């Protein structure tokens, strides 16, 4: 399936600096989501191979 990667920072907080600081308080949720998605994207290459 089409590999989709979403930046947690860009989608949630947006361009605004204030949103970035508030996002930081939450933790590694922004980061953890990226890991899951790339892995799905990486997996799709392996399947075709």
């Amino acid at each position: 399936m089409t590999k989709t990667s979403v930046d947690c920072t860009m989608y949630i907080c947006g361009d605004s600096t204030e949103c970035s600081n508030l996002l930081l308080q939450y933790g590694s949720f922004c980061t953890q989501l990226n890991r899951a998605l790339t892995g799905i994207a990486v997996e799709q290459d392996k399947n075709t191979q």
Partner: protein
């Protein structure tokens, strides 16, 4: 290691390890800062 320097250096920080194995890693988003701010409010003269 200083993250905000070399491209290689940035990779270590996201990875969080001093030694990095061969591969492709994504470290940070790249965005272009707005160069200038332009405002276009109505030109109507009268003071409310």
């Amino acid at each position: 290691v200083d993250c905000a320097l070399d491209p290689l250096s940035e990779t270590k920080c996201t990875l969080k390890s001093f030694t990095v194995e061969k591969g492709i890693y994504q470290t940070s988003n790249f965005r272009v800062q707005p160069t200038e701010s332009i405002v276009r409010f109505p030109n109507i003269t009268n003071l409310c």
